[PDB]
Every structure is written in structure tokens, then in C-alpha cells.
Amino acid sequence: SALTQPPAVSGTPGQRVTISCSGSDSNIGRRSVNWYQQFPGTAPKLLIYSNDQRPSVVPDRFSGSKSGTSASLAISGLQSEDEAEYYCAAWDDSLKGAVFGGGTQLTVLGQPKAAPSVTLFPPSSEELQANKATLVCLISDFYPGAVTVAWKADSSPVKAGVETTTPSKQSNNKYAASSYLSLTPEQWKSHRSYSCQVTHEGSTVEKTVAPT
């Protein structure tokens, strides 16, 4: 993306937050900035246009400014419901095209941090019998909603055969995700253990399973 935003920002209810948008002379330098807000699994909505103008339907606690080749979105009096993804956007004169920022996930801590609950399943005997093997790592009830997953065969990193979902909001307002490691029934049996390691806010939860 030609426009640069911090990928993640956190705030507490009642507090003020700012999300910046770094551009260049061909875009933000010359053109006006637009801001969109997007909640999971739904379309973005227009938040700010022409740098500082607000659609009627937008709370006035939202505001924008433009600083040379940079622009900023400010939210005063953060509410729990502002927890969303925010994008800046500008026309670019060199490209003859519209460009967005990479997005900012804004976390509004209207609830305590929660480490991920991790459930790791070994291949079922049924699956092994039919000559296949899948390790299933289920990750739930964590907040904020980002984790990273790493797999270990014994003590050494596996990279190949890993498929991980993006996180998704639960009913109770916390997040879930899952990661799958597919392998040959022989790779499975040659190792004493495999491990699913899930790092959340710089701390890891691990689970481990064995062919026994």
C-alpha cells in the first residue's frame, strides 16, 4: 500500500486515540484524505471525507486532520463499539488511482485481556487407518483478537502443511481461530511429540500431543 498506517492500536474507554496515515506528494500531499471504518465480515463505512468532514450519521467524537503528506484520525471519548478496523484513502496523481492504507485494528479494552484457550488434537485412529494424518489446533476465547501460531515437530519448527485461519469474533465478544497441520502417518510416528504454540500479546500458550 502507498499509504502507511500502524497495523494495531489500543485504547481504553473514555480515552482519546489517534491513527496516523503516512503518504507522499502525489497522494496526500496533493489530494484530500478519506477515512473508512470496517467491522468484521461487513462493508466499510465512510467516517471522514475531505480530510475533516463528517457524514451526519457519524458521531462528532470522530475527527480528521491533514498535515502535509500525512493525515490523522482522532477519536475522543473512545467507546467499546469503536473497536473496528480503520482505513485511510487518497487519490494518487502519479498512479492515476485510489490508494488505501494497510489498515489499523483498533482495540478498545472494555474488557480484560484473555490468553488463548488452546486445544490440540492428534490424528484420529480412523484417519490414521485410512492412511492420513491431521493435527488440529483450536484456539478460542482470547482478547485482543490477534494471535500467531507456530508448529514444532519435537523441538524443531514445521513450516510445511500448516493452514491457519484468520481470527473471528465469538458471541461473548472474544476471538477464535484454528490451525491445521497435515502430515503422513509416518512423519507422525517418527516423532515423540508435536506442539502447537500460540503467541498472544507476547506470551505463548502451548499444547503437545504424542503418537502414544
Binding site: 462493508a43 475531505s50 485510489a98 486445544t119 488434537f121 483450536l138 478460542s140 484454528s178 491445521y180 497435515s182
Partner: protein, 222 residues
Amino acid sequence: VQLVQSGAEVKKPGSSVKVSCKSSGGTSNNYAISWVRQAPGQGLDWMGGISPIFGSTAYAQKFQGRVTISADIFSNTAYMELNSLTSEDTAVYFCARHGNYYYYSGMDVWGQGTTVTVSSASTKGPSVFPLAPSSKSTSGGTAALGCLVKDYFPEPVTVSWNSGALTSGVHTFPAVLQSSGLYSLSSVVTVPSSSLGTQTYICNVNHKPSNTKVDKRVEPKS
């Protein structure tokens, strides 16, 4: 005014997709319309725009020569056609209307999005495997029981436990789309360990696109 888009699409690699956007509640011909896509877990990506009043169209460089945006001025519908599809084109495609004739203006009305999935797979029912605990049941104690709903296409599959009687402790997770072009998901129910000696747990999987219904008994083993 509302922008309404056509339904989800599944397409083979190399094929073309045409997504429709209609403005219900009056014409959107007097304003610019852009197409923006979002690959899963990624950010908004402008594909191009059209402004029929000027009879002008513009495209992002990265899609030049592959995407065609058009407008049926008579029917008040805009379209986006993307050709030579690969799996990198699996995404949600949004239409959005600008506030004036120009692509620089804020996009103030958005369509609901259209999911396009690009996969070489055809319709296929899932294999279902039971996922059992063995040290989970301690001590006690609750235990996680699951069922792996493997390699199906296309979305979506529904899962219940004990023909619907069991709702406490059930979490069905969103599917992963694997590099094979098929989906897999898992459902888990967390149950009191003690109940495993007296209660039977069965996952019921229904995949309508293939008329597959599977019931699996999940039961810690040996």
C-alpha cells in the same frame, strides 16, 4: 440509496467472474463507482472505477489488462469482470459509490460485498473424523470432544451435536480454505469428564451442496 451486489461466486482457475452492483432507490449514474476488494485477513485494495457521466474508467496498475469495469446506464447497474482467475483472487469484492463524479471523493455508499472463491475443486462432501481426548478428562474436570469435517467444497456445512439436544459447550470454528482448494472445519463440545461413562456424543454434519449428512460417534478410545 442502497447498493446491492450479486451473490457469492465459485470459479475455477483461469475462468472469469462478473460481479453486479445495482443501486436500488434511484439512479447512481451521476456519481463515480469504484470496485474494491479485500483478500482474507488483508486490507482494502482498489481495483478501478467508472464515472459514466464522463464516460471514463480508471484501473489500478496491478489489475490493468485483467479487470473490466462497466456500467449499464439504462439499467443503473455497474459491473466488475475479472479474468484469468487464480487463488490470489479469492476475496470479497465491494462496489462503492463516491460522493461526486470523481474517484478522489469519499465512497459514501457501499454494496454488501460479494465473496468470490477461486478453486479447482468441484462439489464434494466432507470426510468426518471424531476427535477424542485422553488426558483431557482430568481430574475432573471437563473434556474436549471434537469432530473434524475434512476436505469439502464448496461452503457451507452445518454441524450439531446429539441431533440438536446438545448446545452447552459447543463451539464450531470457521473453515480454513486449504491450498488444495477444499475446506475443512472443526466443531468441539466441552463436556464434563464424568459424563463420558454414561452419555454418548454424536456429531451431525450436513453438507447441502452434496446432500451429505454424516453422524459420527465421538468416544475416547482404547
